Each structure stands twice: as C-alpha cells, then as structure tokens.
Design a protein around this ligand. Structure first.
Ligand code: GDU
Ligand code: MN
Ligand code: MN
Length: 283
C-alpha cells in the first residue's frame, strides 16, 4: 500500500497535511476510505479499542462512548472493545452490532484522578502483553469522556498514531504546554517540538502501543520517584514520547473536537467530540 493510493493532501491546502518526516496528517477530504476498507478487508484485520471508566465516569460517559463507538468505529471490520472499570456490576451492557465484541476487566480505582488517568499506561501495557498482542492488528486507546459523531475508520490506522489536541493545533511549539521543568522525565526544552498531541486518543500496532505505554509509564514512575508530577500528567509524557519517536500518522482535530472552541473553517466533519467536560460529577 502506497500513501498516494489513498491520501491526497491537495484536497486540504489550508492545513498541515504532511509532517517534516513525511507522516500524513489526516483531515476530512484527504482520505479514500473505500480503497482502504478493501485493502484492509482483504487482510482480515481486527482492531482493538481500550477504554477506562472509573467511579462516576461509568454512569456519565461509558454507555454513550460504547454506543457511539459501536456505530462509528472501524465499521466493516472486526472490532474488540476492551473495557476497564472498577465496578463491573455497573458496566452498562449495550447491544453491539455485526463484527463487534467485548471483554471487560475489573481494575483497582486509584484514589487520585491524576493517577486514574496515568495508571492506564501501566494497565494497557500489561494487557497488550497478556492478550491484546495476539488478538488485534491495530489498537487505539481512548478517553471515555468523548462521543463518536461520525465515521472513524481505517484511514486512521498506522504503526503509531497520534492526535492533534484541538485547542493547540495552530499554535507555535514554544507556546505549547509541554512539561517545562528539567526535573521531570517529560521535559521538552523550548525550541523543540513538532505538535501538541492529545492523550485522549493514540494507537498503532500492539508492538508500538506497548512501547508508547511502557516508556510513558517509566517516565511517570521516574517523576514519582523524584517527587514531581507533570502538570498535564500522562499527556505530558506522551508528548515527550512522540517527540523522540515520531508518530507515523497524525489525526486532525476533526477526530477529537471540542465544540467549546466553536467550529472554524478547518473542522469539516467531526468524527468524535469532547463530552461537555463536566464541572460537577465524574470526580
Ligand atoms: O474519575 C475519573 C477520572 C478519570 N478517568 C479516566 O481517565 C481519562 C482521562 O481523564 P479526564 O478525561 O478526566 O481528563 P482530561 O479530560 O483532562 O484528559 C486529558 O488530560 C489527562 C491528564 O490530565 C490525560 O492525558 C488524558 O488522556 C487527556 O485527554 C478519562 O477519560 C477516564 O477514562 C476515569 O475513569 N474516572
Ligand atoms: Mn478526557
Ligand atoms: Mn472544553
């Protein structure tokens, strides 16, 4: 498969469509999903999707996330949803459609929400080694407080996939909220950086995602050891990781949009949107 076989950057001249290391940035209008569905279907791929719901997030977001995923995620290809919750008795079983199935695991609820978010890196890694590596060809790891709004398909697959954070995609690197303290493993010096990635969505082959999570958790552990916590937790470490190990594909903010921003000309068709945000329950 050649990049030119399914990707035409000339359809979106007003946004960044190719990185300096030749990785494509996928925006609505640049991909030929029909070509990709055929190619991947012929290889009979299976895609995994992990999602964590702890505490109030279960009743507030899990059902909406799973229902929408079942409807819009990798339609036409086998998908396995890996659900991690602290209380399985509340795991909202919904009806899944053709080619979708699931596997639920009960996890420990971390006291601090910051740790609930960060420990995912450890847990995902353990699961990739234990079984996911044998079950799927590609894997995505996502925040639960989001909803699929339209088709999120095979055009998003790749060795290592990153998401452009909706609020900073047009900002210059020196303005990114990377971790700036040299004392943290997530430290990124001013004068460095390609894009500001969103930890709400990342993926790739099981091998690559294993390295992403393992390296991120190592930094998370190193920081705890030195009594320091990155301001943006796992997102900060993920950004450090992606700086050192460039993603082979990046998804535009259309794949992870926050309507609080509005709806600028660049956002042509939203595939997934941030949930309200909260402000009351959840935590
Ligand atoms: O009480 C909680 C808290 C967190 N989470 C899990 O952790 C994820 C990330 O936390 P939030 O959604 O609450 O936080 P943000 O929206 O701020 O997330 C952003 O910041 C985080 C660190 O602050 C991570 O980097 C995350 O991937 C990124 O999208 C949630 O989707 C959820 O799956 C829970 O289940 N229950
Ligand atoms: Mn979130
Ligand atoms: Mn918002």
């Amino acid at each position: 498969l050649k990049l030119s076989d399914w990707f035409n950057p000339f359809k979106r001249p007003e946004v960044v469509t190719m990185t300096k290391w030749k990785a494509p940035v996928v925006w609505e209008g640049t991909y030929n999903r029909a070509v990709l569905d055929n190619y991947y279907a012929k290889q009979k791929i299976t895609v995994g999707l992990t999602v964590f719901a702890v505490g109030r997030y279960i009743e507030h977001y899990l059902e909406e996330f799973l229902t929408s995923a079942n409807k819009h995620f990798m339609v036409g290809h086998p998908v396995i949803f890996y659900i991690m919750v602290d209380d399985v008795s509340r795991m909202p079983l919904i009806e899944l459609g053709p080619l979708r199935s699931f596997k639920v695991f009960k996890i420990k609820p971390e006291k601090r929400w910051q740790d609930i978010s960060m420990m995912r890196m450890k847990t995902i890694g353990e699961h990739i080694v234990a079984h996911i590596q044998h079950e799927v060809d590609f894997l995505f790891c996502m925040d639960v407080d989001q909803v699929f709004q339209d088709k999120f398909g095979v055009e998003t697959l790749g060795e290592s996939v990153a998401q452009l954070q909706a609020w900073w995609y047009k900002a210059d690197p020196n303005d990114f909220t990377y971790e700036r303290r040299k004392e943290s493993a997530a430290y990124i010096p001013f004068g460095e950086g390609d894009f500001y990635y969103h930890a709400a969505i990342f993926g790739g082959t099981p091998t690559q995602v294993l390295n992403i999570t393992q390296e991120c958790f190592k930094g998370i552990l190193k920081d705890k050891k030195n009594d320091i916590e990155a301001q943006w937790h796992d997102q900060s470490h993920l950004n450090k990781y992606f700086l050192l190990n460039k993603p082979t594909k990046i998804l535009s903010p259309e794949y992870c949009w926050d309507y609080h921003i509005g709806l600028p000309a660049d956002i042509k068709l939203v595939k997934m949107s941030w949930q309200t945000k909260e402000y009351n329950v959840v935590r």
